[PDB]
């Protein structure tokens, strides 16, 4: 009766307990910034190749 | 006794669980001090909300539990004294 | 052995006996300390 | 602007915070009233428009009869009334008492008073935390403080200096369960972490000094003589300086390995040091011999993998470097292969200050080495060996469960130790 | 701040609660008019654990002293120390039980508990943060053995977290005061295991086998025997009342002495016991307070643990030295008698240090020993309770008082198994 | 020229007009006869007393006060006290029987014969002053005179003067310990008159002021008279800018301009920062940063609500003593940085400062310490919808069984207010969250 009601209530409580990624991890600003600065160094080396070709052209033009 | 053991298991589980849930809200605040983090923290919100609903429920339930418990001990000792006095009459 | 043999501190907490007030002259002189007459380098720009 | 706000927790907090804060009153020029009868006090003391110097300290206990004595005796008007925090009942050799139930109404008054000192300090270098694993407040509340210290300050410097239990004797019984389960919280919540053991100061004080039959006060003075050399460079001038950021930089190669040791070199009596030369070679020999350490475990089984040296007084850089080049070469001492150089030196001009009523003499040279090694894998081995000897019969566990706690912390705090017991030979190899 | 509210019961309860409050009154300097004429002011700091406050400098104890006939409290009101207790705090009946459990458990006890349960709620509620209560009765009467077990069972239901200790008096096993004293004892013990936090055990030939042999006496009164069980009784609450390096209280000892709530059966002792003519001939040092405790003579139970195992072992020290030379004896005793401890604990000896000695004395120590030497104590009740109950002896004193024979039968099965619960750890 | 005419209603009003007017006789050097010995004042312009006192024909200064009660036994202490010659005899009004914790008595039946005599004396102190800034009201929600008659006096202060300023500094009931039973019927039913017929309105709960004097000051066992002092320190700091010279002055119109954005929204929170004792004044310096941060501390408020649950809409800082505009603006920049204090999304600047040079005055037999500096702050928040909600908690709980309502009907009160003037409060319970909800 009332005992059975309390039993089913505790059963629902245990259900909620078992029910307990969508959350921000405790630490992660680190990883995010890491990936971002890696993309940064990537585009950096891209521009680097570009300007190194630029300066080879520059030394050629200085010879000209 | 059986209902009391039930209450015990339930309450202790609940304690450890919401302790770890506050621990999780704490991890939140820590990482905090981006918009996806905000969404995760709103998730924390709804979660701990259902959590406190559960807490209030458990409180009231074990309250009713101990109430019926007192009622039981009352009737029992009443009839026990009744038996003893019947024996006295004998 | 006579000062050990022959004897109001029976009632004494160790914090009272082991930590008394030291003399006024045993205080350390700070010989090697950066002088404070010229104020130290501090970011007095409060930003 | 060089502040170091101290945290001391317990009956190891206040019996040590009495001795540590007695040295600084005579290291600088401080009357026990608080006044004075050239600015090194700004790390620890703070000013007012009356010349008073109030320390930047907190003393935390759950027992009034430890801190109702410091506010009774000699150094009484020195401490602010609110800087010393007291409970009303003690957590009584337990974890959950200290961690969940009783620790939750003293977690709030402290964090108001940590915030009031930290708002006063401009250039606050970082907090210092001294406590003991052997009690309720020192091991339950202290790990609760550092679980709520990392959210308020993040990467702010928090150093540990704990009183680990001794491997042969111990004061209690259930004391491993507090000592095991503190490390599950103080791994993610500790920057650097020293260790001492009181039997490894009992034998030193009777051998290396003539004073046998001591108290903890004659053990408290040498603990307070480590801490002066830790903050040595921040107040007095140096040929080379160190700082609070420097120790964890050169002694913590990995963030699950933050366990140095501590050793103080010239521990010789007020008479026996007065009749013998004490050169810089003759103090760096003491810190490497295995009978002088502040722990009871020999590094002959272990490998030194980072080091740090501190120096005081009458030191010349030539003789420092002449005796370093010997102890590199001797094969009683070996290093791991992956630390190529393995040292850090720091020189402070000011010689250390004699305490009236102590057991050390006027000296000119000193060394406070902090050498982490692999010979702490024989420290967690003994704190495990007597924990699964006694968890097999569930010998005390009912004290902990019904105190705002669940059972599952025990079965993971040992499995946390299993990973960190496996960590110390992968790095060790 | 912290308080201890004190319960007594009977003729055992009042001829022990007259001498325990004599040693405490000498400790804090209390004369029999209430006032304070002591020397220092460590003798007035934590006095509120035991004494209340009143008009002027008067300090009247937190004492509940109960009997079922006032021929015991007529004496304790008319001793030297009889004007120090407040007159309301004695509770007396009209016709006592007198060596029967049931008379003071249902008939006369249970109609008297409704005024003792008012004198405790008027007085536990005065305290700010009460630590708990103590009881000191005997299991061989009808006042404390029946009704004192009925206040244990009916104060743990209103305040179920505050502490409950018992300086019980279990039967003397060899020469006994009463025939039917097994029946009063064995029905209290089942009522004792579920509603008590920690239990001492105080026997009276355990006191006789000290004062005969250790203090060399040939006129040992109970007024001598009540000093020996109030020297310990104030030797457990020392660090509440006096500071030290390392402290304790009643809560912190039972934390390290109750592995499981069926296991809180101690046996106490006391270190500095010598004669008056053997007094000056011994130096009062540290190893000579711990060579005496582990010996088989000092204990206040009449049970020898050479057959058993010291499960856990406590200690509480006094005097301004327990720091390094106690830590080479507690390391020595854990190694020399190496077969008297069980394997499954790291280490067993707990430690506290109070720095203030007992008055007229330099140093001391006190023992609280949780043992597997109490399962040979409860077997000499149930080898004489089964040498009585098969022939249904004296039973008409019990079935006509409202009990029944299954209640007698149940206290067999729930004490035969508690020996069979203790018996594995040997 | 810059006058402010106080009106104190009830036993709470009269006992506050015994502590407010003891402060103003030491602030300007008035002996309790009325005479001022020295014509010069130490920080003001020799006519600083005109906001409160007025010259007469004996060289005697008489206040601009009217004290009201429906009972003689609390004003006849004033008439035989130490200050019996300071007050004009018709500025202390008494009836013959009290309204006795009731609304209809003091509003409709008993309040009708003291509504006429008071308005003869209000129009005499408001015809002497050529420059009246506005009245002040010191009443109590849970009485009969402070609720029935004050709502009767507000309602007739509206038409007799129009859009003149009127402020009330009222005593709302405590959430836990109220001294009465039928206080919530009176407390709800006057919440209409503080919304229509009021211009600004503060609330003090005596349970909240008990929490300060026990904790910050070291008075265990305070009384009402260690609480009437701290309400005089709020009132004086509000009107200190009118009387004494300063760098930035703030009038009573620069209050309402800056912290009242909408005319249904005028309930801010009074807080006074350096409340410390002279054994704890010896220890801590009392700089501008240490006195502007303590107002934001929720343990120091003078009402039982926490603004971490609310959005700060506007603020009003008032600085007394040894403050420089350099350091007032320096510590305002710090509290913007912290994320514990949150402003609403439509108030980007959100402040107002007032600097007065005169340090606050200590009283003999008093309780505080003499300090160089001080702060009074009035911030209004969406953390008032929890104080109102702990009185619908206990009006409907009692009115569901129609308990006490027979007392009110037979004294002249129609039954409409027991269903209307809580739903009158339902809208202002619902306004305050909508005016603090984020933009779309």
GROMACS .gro file of N, CA and C in nm, chain F residues 220-305:
model
  258
 1276UNK      N    1   2.613   4.197   2.103
 1276UNK     CA    2   2.517   4.095   2.139
 1276UNK      C    3   2.411   4.158   2.228
 1277UNK      N    4   2.289   4.107   2.216
 1277UNK     CA    5   2.166   4.166   2.269
 1277UNK      C    6   2.150   4.312   2.230
 1278UNK      N    7   2.120   4.345   2.105
 1278UNK     CA    8   2.087   4.482   2.071
 1278UNK      C    9   1.943   4.511   2.110
 1279UNK      N   10   1.898   4.631   2.076
 1279UNK     CA   11   1.763   4.669   2.111
 1279UNK      C   12   1.710   4.734   1.984
 1280UNK      N   13   1.590   4.790   1.984
 1280UNK     CA   14   1.549   4.875   1.873
 1280UNK      C   15   1.632   5.001   1.863
 1281UNK      N   16   1.690   5.047   1.973
 1281UNK     CA   17   1.762   5.174   1.969
 1281UNK      C   18   1.907   5.161   1.925
 1282UNK      N   19   1.958   5.040   1.909
 1282UNK     CA   20   2.081   5.017   1.834
 1282UNK      C   21   2.052   4.983   1.690
 1283UNK      N   22   1.926   4.994   1.650
 1283UNK     CA   23   1.881   4.983   1.512
 1283UNK      C   24   1.830   5.115   1.458
 1284UNK      N   25   1.771   5.199   1.543
 1284UNK     CA   26   1.729   5.331   1.500
 1284UNK      C   27   1.848   5.420   1.468
 1285UNK      N   28   1.966   5.387   1.519
 1285UNK     CA   29   2.084   5.467   1.489
 1285UNK      C   30   2.129   5.446   1.346
 1286UNK      N   31   2.128   5.322   1.299
 1286UNK     CA   32   2.179   5.292   1.167
 1286UNK      C   33   2.087   5.340   1.058
 1287UNK      N   34   1.959   5.361   1.087
 1287UNK     CA   35   1.871   5.421   0.989
 1287UNK      C   36   1.889   5.572   0.982
 1288UNK      N   37   1.939   5.635   1.088
 1288UNK     CA   38   1.975   5.775   1.078
 1288UNK      C   39   2.102   5.799   0.998
 1289UNK      N   40   2.190   5.699   0.987
 1289UNK     CA   41   2.311   5.714   0.908
 1289UNK      C   42   2.284   5.701   0.759
 1290UNK      N   43   2.181   5.627   0.721
 1290UNK     CA   44   2.139   5.625   0.582
 1290UNK      C   45   2.075   5.757   0.544
 1291UNK      N   46   1.989   5.810   0.631
 1291UNK     CA   47   1.911   5.928   0.597
 1291UNK      C   48   2.000   6.049   0.590
 1292UNK      N   49   2.096   6.059   0.682
 1292UNK     CA   50   2.186   6.173   0.682
 1292UNK      C   51   2.276   6.174   0.560
 1293UNK      N   52   2.325   6.057   0.517
 1293UNK     CA   53   2.411   6.049   0.400
 1293UNK      C   54   2.338   6.083   0.271
 1294UNK      N   55   2.207   6.056   0.265
 1294UNK     CA   56   2.127   6.096   0.150
 1294UNK      C   57   2.118   6.248   0.140
 1295UNK      N   58   2.093   6.315   0.251
 1295UNK     CA   59   2.081   6.460   0.253
 1295UNK      C   60   2.204   6.531   0.306
 1296UNK      N   61   2.317   6.462   0.319
 1296UNK     CA   62   2.441   6.532   0.352
 1296UNK      C   63   2.487   6.618   0.237
 1297UNK      N   64   2.454   6.580   0.114
 1297UNK     CA   65   2.497   6.656  -0.002
 1297UNK      C   66   2.423   6.788  -0.016
 1298UNK      N   67   2.307   6.802   0.047
 1298UNK     CA   68   2.237   6.929   0.046
 1298UNK      C   69   2.300   7.029   0.141
 1299UNK      N   70   2.350   6.984   0.255
 1299UNK     CA   71   2.387   7.074   0.364
 1299UNK      C   72   2.533   7.118   0.362
 1300UNK      N   73   2.627   7.026   0.344
 1300UNK     CA   74   2.769   7.056   0.354
 1300UNK      C   75   2.835   7.057   0.217
 1301UNK      N   76   2.945   7.132   0.208
 1301UNK     CA   77   3.013   7.155   0.081
 1301UNK      C   78   3.081   7.029   0.031
 1302UNK      N   79   3.088   7.015  -0.101
 1302UNK     CA   80   3.146   6.895  -0.158
 1302UNK      C   81   3.194   6.917  -0.300
 1303UNK      N   82   3.263   6.815  -0.351
 1303UNK     CA   83   3.312   6.820  -0.488
 1303UNK      C   84   3.198   6.797  -0.587
 1304UNK      N   85   3.136   6.680  -0.582
 1304UNK     CA   86   3.013   6.654  -0.656
 1304UNK      C   87   2.897   6.645  -0.559
 1305UNK      N   88   2.803   6.736  -0.571
 1305UNK     CA   89   2.681   6.729  -0.494
 1305UNK      C   90   2.577   6.649  -0.571
 1306UNK      N   91   2.490   6.582  -0.496
 1306UNK     CA   92   2.377   6.510  -0.552
 1306UNK      C   93   2.252   6.549  -0.475
 1307UNK      N   94   2.155   6.605  -0.545
 1307UNK     CA   95   2.030   6.648  -0.484
 1307UNK      C   96   1.934   6.530  -0.472
 1308UNK      N   97   1.808   6.559  -0.442
 1308UNK     CA   98   1.707   6.454  -0.438
 1308UNK      C   99   1.647   6.427  -0.574
 1309UNK      N  100   1.670   6.515  -0.671
 1309UNK     CA  101   1.622   6.487  -0.806
 1309UNK      C  102   1.725   6.407  -0.884
 1310UNK      N  103   1.853   6.420  -0.850
 1310UNK     CA  104   1.953   6.335  -0.913
 1310UNK      C  105   1.952   6.193  -0.859
 1311UNK      N  106   1.879   6.167  -0.751
 1311UNK     CA  107   1.845   6.029  -0.714
 1311UNK      C  108   1.750   5.969  -0.816
 1312UNK      N  109   1.633   6.032  -0.829
 1312UNK     CA  110   1.521   5.976  -0.901
 1312UNK      C  111   1.549   5.970  -1.050
 1313UNK      N  112   1.634   6.060  -1.098
 1313UNK     CA  113   1.667   6.063  -1.239
 1313UNK      C  114   1.747   5.939  -1.277
 1314UNK      N  115   1.832   5.893  -1.187
 1314UNK     CA  116   1.934   5.797  -1.226
 1314UNK      C  117   1.898   5.653  -1.190
 1315UNK      N  118   1.824   5.631  -1.081
 1315UNK     CA  119   1.789   5.494  -1.042
 1315UNK      C  120   1.642   5.459  -1.060
 1316UNK      N  121   1.560   5.549  -1.114
 1316UNK     CA  122   1.420   5.518  -1.141
 1316UNK      C  123   1.399   5.523  -1.291
 1317UNK      N  124   1.414   5.412  -1.362
 1317UNK     CA  125   1.400   5.416  -1.507
 1317UNK      C  126   1.255   5.421  -1.551
 1318UNK      N  127   1.166   5.355  -1.477
 1318UNK     CA  128   1.024   5.347  -1.507
 1318UNK      C  129   0.944   5.380  -1.382
 1319UNK      N  130   0.829   5.445  -1.396
 1319UNK     CA  131   0.759   5.496  -1.277
 1319UNK      C  132   0.687   5.390  -1.194
 1320UNK      N  133   0.673   5.267  -1.244
 1320UNK     CA  134   0.628   5.155  -1.163
 1320UNK      C  135   0.742   5.086  -1.091
 1321UNK      N  136   0.865   5.132  -1.111
 1321UNK     CA  137   0.984   5.066  -1.060
 1321UNK      C  138   1.061   5.168  -0.978
 1322UNK      N  139   1.035   5.172  -0.847
 1322UNK     CA  140   1.105   5.261  -0.755
 1322UNK      C  141   1.132   5.195  -0.620
 1323UNK      N  142   1.186   5.073  -0.618
 1323UNK     CA  143   1.218   5.005  -0.493
 1323UNK      C  144   1.365   4.964  -0.485
 1324UNK      N  145   1.455   5.057  -0.450
 1324UNK     CA  146   1.595   5.020  -0.433
 1324UNK      C  147   1.632   4.967  -0.295
 1325UNK      N  148   1.761   4.943  -0.272
 1325UNK     CA  149   1.809   4.876  -0.152
 1325UNK      C  150   1.912   4.962  -0.081
 1326UNK      N  151   1.887   4.993   0.046
 1326UNK     CA  152   1.976   5.078   0.125
 1326UNK      C  153   2.085   4.993   0.190
 1327UNK      N  154   2.210   5.036   0.176
 1327UNK     CA  155   2.324   4.970   0.238
 1327UNK      C  156   2.425   5.074   0.282
 1328UNK      N  157   2.478   5.059   0.404
 1328UNK     CA  158   2.575   5.153   0.459
 1328UNK      C  159   2.699   5.075   0.500
 1329UNK      N  160   2.815   5.112   0.444
 1329UNK     CA  161   2.927   5.020   0.443
 1329UNK      C  162   3.011   5.011   0.571
 1330UNK      N  163   3.082   5.117   0.617
 1330UNK     CA  164   3.173   5.086   0.729
 1330UNK      C  165   3.101   5.087   0.864
 1331UNK      N  166   3.035   4.975   0.891
 1331UNK     CA  167   2.972   4.950   1.021
 1331UNK      C  168   3.065   4.857   1.099
 1332UNK      N  169   3.153   4.919   1.178
 1332UNK     CA  170   3.255   4.849   1.255
 1332UNK      C  171   3.266   4.914   1.392
 1333UNK      N  172   3.324   4.841   1.486
 1333UNK     CA  173   3.340   4.889   1.622
 1333UNK      C  174   3.480   4.944   1.644
 1334UNK      N  175   3.494   5.024   1.749
 1334UNK     CA  176   3.618   5.097   1.777
 1334UNK      C  177   3.727   5.009   1.834
 1335UNK      N  178   3.701   4.880   1.855
 1335UNK     CA  179   3.806   4.783   1.879
 1335UNK      C  180   3.844   4.707   1.753
 1336UNK      N  181   3.765   4.719   1.647
 1336UNK     CA  182   3.800   4.668   1.516
 1336UNK      C  183   3.821   4.780   1.416
 1337UNK      N  184   3.807   4.905   1.459
 1337UNK     CA  185   3.853   5.018   1.380
 1337UNK      C  186   4.002   5.041   1.398
 1338UNK      N  187   4.059   4.989   1.506
 1338UNK     CA  188   4.201   5.005   1.533
 1338UNK      C  189   4.285   4.921   1.439
 1339UNK      N  190   4.226   4.818   1.379
 1339UNK     CA  191   4.302   4.718   1.306
 1339UNK      C  192   4.310   4.742   1.157
 1340UNK      N  193   4.204   4.792   1.095
 1340UNK     CA  194   4.193   4.797   0.950
 1340UNK      C  195   4.181   4.941   0.903
 1341UNK      N  196   4.264   4.978   0.805
 1341UNK     CA  197   4.246   5.106   0.737
 1341UNK      C  198   4.119   5.101   0.654
 1342UNK      N  199   4.062   5.218   0.632
 1342UNK     CA  200   3.924   5.224   0.586
 1342UNK      C  201   3.917   5.301   0.454
 1343UNK      N  202   4.000   5.260   0.358
 1343UNK     CA  203   4.014   5.327   0.231
 1343UNK      C  204   3.888   5.314   0.146
 1344UNK      N  205   3.891   5.381   0.030
 1344UNK     CA  206   3.775   5.388  -0.058
 1344UNK      C  207   3.742   5.252  -0.117
 1345UNK      N  208   3.844   5.172  -0.146
 1345UNK     CA  209   3.818   5.038  -0.198
 1345UNK      C  210   3.761   4.945  -0.091
 1346UNK      N  211   3.797   4.965   0.035
 1346UNK     CA  212   3.745   4.878   0.140
 1346UNK      C  213   3.605   4.918   0.183
 1347UNK      N  214   3.556   5.034   0.139
 1347UNK     CA  215   3.421   5.077   0.172
 1347UNK      C  216   3.328   5.082   0.051
 1348UNK      N  217   3.379   5.063  -0.070
 1348UNK     CA  218   3.288   5.051  -0.183
 1348UNK      C  219   3.267   4.907  -0.226
 1349UNK      N  220   3.343   4.814  -0.171
 1349UNK     CA  221   3.323   4.674  -0.204
 1349UNK      C  222   3.229   4.608  -0.106
 1350UNK      N  223   3.221   4.660   0.017
 1350UNK     CA  224   3.142   4.597   0.121
 1350UNK      C  225   2.993   4.622   0.105
 1351UNK      N  226   2.953   4.721   0.024
 1351UNK     CA  227   2.811   4.739  -0.007
 1351UNK      C  228   2.758   4.628  -0.096
 1352UNK      N  229   2.841   4.577  -0.187
 1352UNK     CA  230   2.803   4.468  -0.275
 1352UNK      C  231   2.803   4.334  -0.206
 1353UNK      N  232   2.856   4.325  -0.086
 1353UNK     CA  233   2.857   4.199  -0.013
 1353UNK      C  234   2.716   4.172   0.037
 1354UNK      N  235   2.655   4.059   0.000
 1354UNK     CA  236   2.513   4.038   0.032
 1354UNK      C  237   2.484   4.018   0.180
 1355UNK      N  238   2.585   3.990   0.262
 1355UNK     CA  239   2.563   3.979   0.405
 1355UNK      C  240   2.545   4.113   0.473
 1356UNK      N  241   2.571   4.224   0.405
 1356UNK     CA  242   2.568   4.357   0.465
 1356UNK      C  243   2.444   4.436   0.427
 1357UNK      N  244   2.348   4.375   0.360
 1357UNK     CA  245   2.231   4.447   0.313
 1357UNK      C  246   2.140   4.483   0.430
 1358UNK      N  247   2.042   4.570   0.403
 1358UNK     CA  248   1.940   4.604   0.500
 1358UNK      C  249   1.802   4.560   0.454
 1359UNK      N  250   1.797   4.442   0.393
 1359UNK     CA  251   1.674   4.372   0.358
 1359UNK      C  252   1.716   4.228   0.334
 1360UNK      N  253   1.622   4.135   0.344
 1360UNK     CA  254   1.656   3.993   0.331
 1360UNK      C  255   1.635   3.946   0.187
 1361UNK      N  256   1.719   3.998   0.098
 1361UNK     CA  257   1.726   3.951  -0.040
 1361UNK      C  258   1.870   3.955  -0.087
   0.00000   0.00000   0.00000
